[PDB]
Amino acid sequence: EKGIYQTSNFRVQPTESIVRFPNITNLCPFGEVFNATRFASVYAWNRKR
Amino acid sequence: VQLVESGGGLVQPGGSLRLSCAASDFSFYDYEMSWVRQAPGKALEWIGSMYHSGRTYINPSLKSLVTISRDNSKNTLYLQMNSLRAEDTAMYYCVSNWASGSTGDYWGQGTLVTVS
């Protein structure tokens, strides 16, 4: 019959998910063990937290 | 510098030479000590090393003229090299806590030596 009927809804689907992080490059301390200028001895290793 | 060395000078080929560097506390020499020198135009040449008890191992390449005396109360150790040849016009160094690693050793300055 004549009139106005509500059938469904509408929704704009999104694209291009975006992830943003700050300049978190504070320390990254691996140059003291990986490529030390003078490598540590065999039995006196260096422990660096 | 907290580590000084005494000895050297112009010596006729064949003389003797000595170096003196000392510490103060009994526990500062834990646990490894050695010696090293850098002649101009020469790479690193390790000679010998010893632990607290005094057991020594020496590089076999130049192990014929090695003699070392050690003290504990004076907190010292001496590397004595004799028969001064014409290839020792460089600077020497003694090191405390040699094996502790890259950041666990303290270096010195040495003295000039003239050889003909």
PDB file of C-alpha atoms in Angstrom:
ATOM      1  CA  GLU A   1       0.000   0.000   0.000  1.00  0.00           C
ATOM      2  CA  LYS A   2       1.061   3.584  -0.616  1.00  0.00           C
ATOM      3  CA  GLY A   3       3.157   5.357   1.986  1.00  0.00           C
ATOM      4  CA  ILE A   4       6.720   5.549   3.269  1.00  0.00           C
ATOM      5  CA  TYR A   5       8.511   2.476   4.629  1.00  0.00           C
ATOM      6  CA  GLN A   6      11.884   2.128   6.345  1.00  0.00           C
ATOM      7  CA  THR A   7      13.646  -0.921   4.890  1.00  0.00           C
ATOM      8  CA  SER A   8      17.364  -0.854   5.747  1.00  0.00           C
ATOM      9  CA  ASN A   9      20.192   1.490   6.757  1.00  0.00           C
ATOM     10  CA  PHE A  10      23.268   3.007   5.119  1.00  0.00           C
ATOM     11  CA  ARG A  11      26.897   3.150   6.232  1.00  0.00           C
ATOM     12  CA  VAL A  12      30.003   4.433   4.447  1.00  0.00           C
ATOM     13  CA  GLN A  13      32.573   1.649   4.682  1.00  0.00           C
ATOM     14  CA  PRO A  14      36.116   2.846   5.483  1.00  0.00           C
ATOM     15  CA  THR A  15      39.427   2.214   3.741  1.00  0.00           C
ATOM     16  CA  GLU A  16      43.139   2.919   4.255  1.00  0.00           C
ATOM     17  CA  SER A  17      43.619   1.910   7.873  1.00  0.00           C
ATOM     18  CA  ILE A  18      46.074   4.348   9.459  1.00  0.00           C
ATOM     19  CA  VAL A  19      48.549   3.603  12.259  1.00  0.00           C
ATOM     20  CA  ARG A  20      50.573   6.479  13.722  1.00  0.00           C
ATOM     21  CA  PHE A  21      53.367   6.214  16.295  1.00  0.00           C
ATOM     22  CA  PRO A  22      55.659   8.915  17.736  1.00  0.00           C
ATOM     23  CA  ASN A  23      59.427   9.271  17.318  1.00  0.00           C
ATOM     24  CA  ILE A  24      60.118   6.462  19.793  1.00  0.00           C
ATOM     25  CA  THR A  25      63.784   5.814  18.961  1.00  0.00           C
ATOM     26  CA  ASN A  26      65.168   6.604  22.407  1.00  0.00           C
ATOM     27  CA  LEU A  27      68.168   4.353  23.105  1.00  0.00           C
ATOM     28  CA  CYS A  28      68.347   1.125  21.043  1.00  0.00           C
ATOM     29  CA  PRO A  29      71.444  -0.123  22.964  1.00  0.00           C
ATOM     30  CA  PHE A  30      73.077  -2.822  20.845  1.00  0.00           C
ATOM     31  CA  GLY A  31      76.228  -1.042  19.642  1.00  0.00           C
ATOM     32  CA  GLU A  32      77.968  -1.764  22.954  1.00  0.00           C
ATOM     33  CA  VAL A  33      77.927  -5.541  22.325  1.00  0.00           C
ATOM     34  CA  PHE A  34      77.342  -6.200  18.611  1.00  0.00           C
ATOM     35  CA  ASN A  35      80.135  -3.983  17.243  1.00  0.00           C
ATOM     36  CA  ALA A  36      82.283  -2.900  20.174  1.00  0.00           C
ATOM     37  CA  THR A  37      85.596  -1.388  19.097  1.00  0.00           C
ATOM     38  CA  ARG A  38      87.544  -3.952  21.158  1.00  0.00           C
ATOM     39  CA  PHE A  39      85.609  -7.183  21.643  1.00  0.00           C
ATOM     40  CA  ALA A  40      85.310  -8.490  25.193  1.00  0.00           C
ATOM     41  CA  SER A  41      87.496 -11.379  26.309  1.00  0.00           C
ATOM     42  CA  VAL A  42      86.361 -14.998  26.322  1.00  0.00           C
ATOM     43  CA  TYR A  43      85.821 -15.392  30.086  1.00  0.00           C
ATOM     44  CA  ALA A  44      85.003 -11.804  31.169  1.00  0.00           C
ATOM     45  CA  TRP A  45      81.826 -11.084  29.206  1.00  0.00           C
ATOM     46  CA  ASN A  46      80.024  -7.755  29.571  1.00  0.00           C
ATOM     47  CA  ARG A  47      76.474  -7.796  30.948  1.00  0.00           C
ATOM     48  CA  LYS A  48      74.478  -4.713  29.913  1.00  0.00           C
ATOM     49  CA  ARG A  49      70.772  -4.535  30.723  1.00  0.00           C
TER      50      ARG A  49
ATOM     51  CA  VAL B   1      96.145  10.026  34.590  1.00  0.00           C
ATOM     52  CA  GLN B   2      95.618   7.494  37.393  1.00  0.00           C
ATOM     53  CA  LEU B   3      98.380   5.276  35.945  1.00  0.00           C
ATOM     54  CA  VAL B   4     101.893   6.536  35.158  1.00  0.00           C
ATOM     55  CA  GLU B   5     104.999   4.716  33.919  1.00  0.00           C
ATOM     56  CA  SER B   6     108.658   5.494  34.641  1.00  0.00           C
ATOM     57  CA  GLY B   7     111.534   4.331  32.463  1.00  0.00           C
ATOM     58  CA  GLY B   8     113.069   4.622  29.026  1.00  0.00           C
ATOM     59  CA  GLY B   9     115.430   6.968  27.237  1.00  0.00           C
ATOM     60  CA  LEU B  10     118.295   6.780  24.774  1.00  0.00           C
ATOM     61  CA  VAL B  11     120.039   3.446  25.402  1.00  0.00           C
ATOM     62  CA  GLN B  12     122.767   1.740  23.397  1.00  0.00           C
ATOM     63  CA  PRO B  13     121.525  -1.437  21.628  1.00  0.00           C
ATOM     64  CA  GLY B  14     121.612  -4.211  24.230  1.00  0.00           C
ATOM     65  CA  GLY B  15     120.657  -2.376  27.438  1.00  0.00           C
ATOM     66  CA  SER B  16     117.857  -2.978  29.917  1.00  0.00           C
ATOM     67  CA  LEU B  17     114.575  -1.151  30.455  1.00  0.00           C
ATOM     68  CA  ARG B  18     111.830  -1.100  33.082  1.00  0.00           C
ATOM     69  CA  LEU B  19     108.401   0.420  33.687  1.00  0.00           C
ATOM     70  CA  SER B  20     106.694   1.125  37.013  1.00  0.00           C
ATOM     71  CA  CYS B  21     102.955   1.613  37.509  1.00  0.00           C
ATOM     72  CA  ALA B  22     101.260   1.100  40.862  1.00  0.00           C
ATOM     73  CA  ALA B  23      97.864   1.102  42.560  1.00  0.00           C
ATOM     74  CA  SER B  24      96.689   1.480  46.157  1.00  0.00           C
ATOM     75  CA  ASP B  25      93.834  -0.868  47.130  1.00  0.00           C
ATOM     76  CA  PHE B  26      94.104  -4.644  47.447  1.00  0.00           C
ATOM     77  CA  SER B  27      90.867  -5.317  45.542  1.00  0.00           C
ATOM     78  CA  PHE B  28      91.570  -3.033  42.561  1.00  0.00           C
ATOM     79  CA  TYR B  29      93.546  -5.697  40.672  1.00  0.00           C
ATOM     80  CA  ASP B  30      90.608  -8.096  40.200  1.00  0.00           C
ATOM     81  CA  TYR B  31      91.412 -10.024  38.327  1.00  0.00           C
ATOM     82  CA  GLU B  32      93.404  -9.849  35.085  1.00  0.00           C
ATOM     83  CA  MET B  33      96.448  -7.788  34.109  1.00  0.00           C
ATOM     84  CA  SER B  34      98.620  -7.650  30.998  1.00  0.00           C
ATOM     85  CA  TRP B  35     100.897  -5.374  28.977  1.00  0.00           C
ATOM     86  CA  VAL B  36     100.856  -3.996  25.438  1.00  0.00           C
ATOM     87  CA  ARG B  37     102.853  -1.681  23.175  1.00  0.00           C
ATOM     88  CA  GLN B  38     102.228   0.019  19.817  1.00  0.00           C
ATOM     89  CA  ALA B  39     105.356   0.559  17.751  1.00  0.00           C
ATOM     90  CA  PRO B  40     104.845   2.953  14.816  1.00  0.00           C
ATOM     91  CA  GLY B  41     104.055   0.855  11.770  1.00  0.00           C
ATOM     92  CA  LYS B  42     103.345  -2.239  13.892  1.00  0.00           C
ATOM     93  CA  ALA B  43     100.036  -3.849  14.823  1.00  0.00           C
ATOM     94  CA  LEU B  44      99.038  -5.025  18.294  1.00  0.00           C
ATOM     95  CA  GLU B  45     101.462  -7.508  19.886  1.00  0.00           C
ATOM     96  CA  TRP B  46     100.259  -8.996  23.163  1.00  0.00           C
ATOM     97  CA  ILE B  47     103.051 -10.563  25.231  1.00  0.00           C
ATOM     98  CA  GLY B  48     101.770 -12.097  28.466  1.00  0.00           C
ATOM     99  CA  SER B  49      99.049 -12.161  31.089  1.00  0.00           C
ATOM    100  CA  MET B  50      98.496 -13.450  34.610  1.00  0.00           C
ATOM    101  CA  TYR B  51      95.703 -13.901  37.136  1.00  0.00           C
ATOM    102  CA  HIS B  52      95.635 -13.039  40.841  1.00  0.00           C
ATOM    103  CA  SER B  53      97.510 -16.225  41.785  1.00  0.00           C
ATOM    104  CA  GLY B  54     100.274 -15.367  39.306  1.00  0.00           C
ATOM    105  CA  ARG B  55      99.946 -18.128  36.705  1.00  0.00           C
ATOM    106  CA  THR B  56     101.315 -16.757  33.434  1.00  0.00           C
ATOM    107  CA  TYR B  57     100.948 -17.542  29.743  1.00  0.00           C
ATOM    108  CA  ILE B  58     103.108 -15.824  27.128  1.00  0.00           C
ATOM    109  CA  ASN B  59     102.689 -15.417  23.373  1.00  0.00           C
ATOM    110  CA  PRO B  60     105.062 -18.027  21.866  1.00  0.00           C
ATOM    111  CA  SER B  61     106.149 -15.698  19.044  1.00  0.00           C
ATOM    112  CA  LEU B  62     108.278 -13.455  21.310  1.00  0.00           C
ATOM    113  CA  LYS B  63     108.357 -15.448  24.560  1.00  0.00           C
ATOM    114  CA  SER B  64     112.149 -15.693  24.923  1.00  0.00           C
ATOM    115  CA  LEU B  65     112.785 -12.501  26.964  1.00  0.00           C
ATOM    116  CA  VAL B  66     109.827 -12.336  29.375  1.00  0.00           C
ATOM    117  CA  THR B  67     110.422 -11.809  33.102  1.00  0.00           C
ATOM    118  CA  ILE B  68     107.846 -10.291  35.465  1.00  0.00           C
ATOM    119  CA  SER B  69     107.862  -9.586  39.208  1.00  0.00           C
ATOM    120  CA  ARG B  70     104.647  -8.886  41.111  1.00  0.00           C
ATOM    121  CA  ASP B  71     103.645  -7.342  44.438  1.00  0.00           C
ATOM    122  CA  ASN B  72     100.389  -7.204  46.396  1.00  0.00           C
ATOM    123  CA  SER B  73     100.875  -4.928  49.417  1.00  0.00           C
ATOM    124  CA  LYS B  74     102.515  -2.323  47.184  1.00  0.00           C
ATOM    125  CA  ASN B  75      99.805  -3.241  44.633  1.00  0.00           C
ATOM    126  CA  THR B  76     102.250  -3.233  41.709  1.00  0.00           C
ATOM    127  CA  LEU B  77     103.461  -5.363  38.808  1.00  0.00           C
ATOM    128  CA  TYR B  78     106.499  -4.922  36.557  1.00  0.00           C
ATOM    129  CA  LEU B  79     107.104  -6.061  32.978  1.00  0.00           C
ATOM    130  CA  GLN B  80     110.881  -6.268  32.529  1.00  0.00           C
ATOM    131  CA  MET B  81     112.219  -6.377  28.966  1.00  0.00           C
ATOM    132  CA  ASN B  82     115.979  -6.661  28.462  1.00  0.00           C
ATOM    133  CA  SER B  83     118.357  -6.561  25.482  1.00  0.00           C
ATOM    134  CA  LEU B  84     117.044  -3.294  24.065  1.00  0.00           C
ATOM    135  CA  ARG B  85     117.231  -3.571  20.280  1.00  0.00           C
ATOM    136  CA  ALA B  86     116.785  -0.818  17.674  1.00  0.00           C
ATOM    137  CA  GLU B  87     113.040  -1.489  17.221  1.00  0.00           C
ATOM    138  CA  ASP B  88     111.707  -0.097  20.525  1.00  0.00           C
ATOM    139  CA  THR B  89     111.379   3.633  19.794  1.00  0.00           C
ATOM    140  CA  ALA B  90     107.725   3.687  20.808  1.00  0.00           C
ATOM    141  CA  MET B  91     105.398   4.101  23.794  1.00  0.00           C
ATOM    142  CA  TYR B  92     104.362   1.385  26.245  1.00  0.00           C
ATOM    143  CA  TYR B  93     101.243   0.814  28.343  1.00  0.00           C
ATOM    144  CA  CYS B  94     100.305  -1.168  31.442  1.00  0.00           C
ATOM    145  CA  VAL B  95      96.619  -1.906  31.991  1.00  0.00           C
ATOM    146  CA  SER B  96      94.479  -2.770  35.016  1.00  0.00           C
ATOM    147  CA  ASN B  97      91.445  -5.052  34.625  1.00  0.00           C
ATOM    148  CA  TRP B  98      92.617  -5.916  31.123  1.00  0.00           C
ATOM    149  CA  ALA B  99      90.184  -8.740  30.367  1.00  0.00           C
ATOM    150  CA  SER B 100      87.066  -7.055  31.808  1.00  0.00           C
ATOM    151  CA  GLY B 101      86.025  -6.026  28.298  1.00  0.00           C
ATOM    152  CA  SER B 102      85.762  -2.970  26.088  1.00  0.00           C
ATOM    153  CA  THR B 103      84.605  -0.671  28.909  1.00  0.00           C
ATOM    154  CA  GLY B 104      86.270  -2.472  31.821  1.00  0.00           C
ATOM    155  CA  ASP B 105      89.906  -1.474  31.297  1.00  0.00           C
ATOM    156  CA  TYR B 106      91.864   1.714  32.007  1.00  0.00           C
ATOM    157  CA  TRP B 107      94.783   2.788  29.826  1.00  0.00           C
ATOM    158  CA  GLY B 108      97.957   4.813  30.312  1.00  0.00           C
ATOM    159  CA  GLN B 109     100.431   7.173  28.639  1.00  0.00           C
ATOM    160  CA  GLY B 110     103.909   5.596  28.611  1.00  0.00           C
ATOM    161  CA  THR B 111     107.297   7.233  28.113  1.00  0.00           C
ATOM    162  CA  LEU B 112     109.388   7.905  25.016  1.00  0.00           C
ATOM    163  CA  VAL B 113     112.346   5.629  24.246  1.00  0.00           C
ATOM    164  CA  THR B 114     115.183   6.307  21.792  1.00  0.00           C
ATOM    165  CA  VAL B 115     117.032   3.362  20.228  1.00  0.00           C
ATOM    166  CA  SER B 116     119.740   3.318  17.561  1.00  0.00           C
TER     167      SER B 116
END
